From a paper:
The Hermes DNA transposon is a member of the eukaryotic hAT superfamily, and its transposase forms a ring-shaped tetramer of dimers. The Hermes transposase is composed of 612 amino acids and is organized in four domains. Architecturally, the Hermes transposase is unusual as it spontaneously forms a ring-shaped tetramer of dimers. All hAT transposases are predicted to contain an N-terminal [name] zinc-finger domain organized around a conserved CCHH or CCHC motif that coordinates Zn2+13, but no structural information is available for Hermes as the constructs used in previous structural work lacked the first 78 amino acids.
The complex crystallized in space group P6522 with a crystallographic twofold axis perpendicular to the oligonucleotide that intersected it at its central base pair. Thus, the asymmetric unit contained one [name] domain and one DNA strand of the duplex. Each [name] domain contains at its C-terminal a CCHC zinc-finger involving residues C51, C54, H71, and C73 that coordinate a bound Zn2+ ion. The two [name] domains bound to the imperfect palindrome do not contact each other, but each C-terminal α-helix between T65 and R70 (α3) is deeply inserted into the major groove. Key to binding the imperfect palindrome is the ability of the N67/R70 pair of the [name] domain to assume alternate conformations. In the other half (BED2, shown in green), the position that was occupied by A18 is now replaced by G20, which is less competent to interact with N67. We observe that N67 is completely displaced, no longer facing the DNA but instead interacting with K59 and the phosphate of G19, with R70 now in its place to interact with G19. Thus, the structure shows that the single [name] domain of the Hermes monomer is able to form specific interactions with two related but distinct DNA motifs. Therefore, only simultaneous double interaction events were observed consistent with cooperative binding. As the crystal structure of the [name]/DNA complex showed no evidence of protein-protein contacts, it appears therefore, that cooperativity is the result of DNA deformation.
Numbering used by the authors:
A (entry chain A), B (entry chain A): 4 to 77
The structure:
DNA sequence: AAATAAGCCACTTGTTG
DNA sequence: AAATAAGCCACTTGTTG
C-alpha cells in the first residue's frame, strides 16, 4: 500500500522530515511534513516524530491526527 | 435513516429498553438493548441511558460503543 | 473560508478469560 | 471462539479567530 511506499523512502533517506507545519494545533509539536528529493511536500501524509509512523493527512479534518496516541498525550 | 426509525419507536413506547446486556464490558452499565412489541431484541442497535441516543452495535467490535462519551467516563 | 476537531461508524488486527 | 477493544481512517456537522 501507498503508506509503506512513503515509509520506505524515509528509511532510505529519499524523503526528509520537514522542521514544522504552519498551524495552531498542538499536533504539530509531534507531527511533521514529508519532503521529496526536489524539496516538494508529499501530499496526503504526515510523520509522527514519537512512533515514526506515516499517518494520513486530509485538510478537511484533523481528528485522526488529533486522537493518535502520541498527540493525545498533549 | 434506520437510526431515527428506532429512536421514534422508543419515544412512542413501541420499543422498550431492556434491563441489561449480558457481558463483561463497562459499557453495559450505561448502554442497553432495545425490545420490540413482541419482546424480540432489535438487532444492530443499542441505547445510551445517559444521552438517550441510539448507537450502532456490531458484535465484531465494541470500540464505537467504548469511546462514546458516556462510556468513556467510566 | 483557512484551520481545527467533536463525535458518530467502518474496519483489521490483536487480545484474553 | 465468545467477548472486548486498540488504533488506524472515513465522514458530516459544528466551531472560531
Ligand atoms: Zn506517534
Ligand atoms: Zn450517551
Amino acid at each position: 500500500m501507498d503508506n509503506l511506499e512513503v515509509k520506505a523512502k524515509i528509511n532510505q533517506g529519499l524523503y526528509k522530515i520537514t522542521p514544522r507545519h504552519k498551524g495552531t494545533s498542538f499536533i504539530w509539536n509531534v507531527l511533521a511534513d514529508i519532503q521529496k528529493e526536489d524539496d516538494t511536500l508529499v501530499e496526503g501524509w504526515v510523520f509522527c516524530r514519537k512512533c515514526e509512523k506515516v499517518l494520513k493527512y486530509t485538510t478537511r479534518q484533523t481528528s485522526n491526527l488529533c486522537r493518535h496516541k502520541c498527540c493525545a498525550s498533549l
